[PDB]
Amino acid sequence: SMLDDAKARLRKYDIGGKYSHLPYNKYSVLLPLVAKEGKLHLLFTVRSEKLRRAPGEVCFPGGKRDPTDMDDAATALREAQEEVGLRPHQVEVVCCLVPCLIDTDTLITPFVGLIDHNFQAQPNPAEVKDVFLVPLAYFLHPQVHDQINHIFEYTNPEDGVTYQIKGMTANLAVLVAFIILEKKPT
């Protein structure tokens, strides 16, 4: 099936806990996969305008590890619950992808999660201005704008709203799209 095929592809790229004990300032992100209308989508947040760093930017749910977290996956799930109301029973964490090194002292670990079809986002307005879906196949043929570095513009056909996706967020979306959709029969 579509979902069994996606999980099987994703498991081949799982690094597991290999880099998780290293002495960095630690953050985790959740790459949330949603199945609608017979296709896979990624769920994104728009950060509240009130926030100190990167107000109004498109991001994945996530944040800083705290002492309560049993592991890096737990960080991603705690932050996702706080930000968009995603409960643990509504997500299956399938794997841990390549971590992102930044600032010389910081390691950001991404986890891909399959999201339950009965989940409905409840944006917490102190942290998140908006939540939206992009079809995973978009990241194979994105509408690119050069700012000089590459920015994706996605327009939601439901309402005509345009979102800008860039940086680590755009990079990870492309990675997930390649892993799941490369070399598939029609």
Ligand SMILES: O=C(Cc1ccccc1)Nc1ccon1
């Ligand atoms: O902050 C994140 C993810 C993140 C954290 C740290 C480093 C890179 C990415 N997601 C949010 C926060 C509010 O709305 N979305």
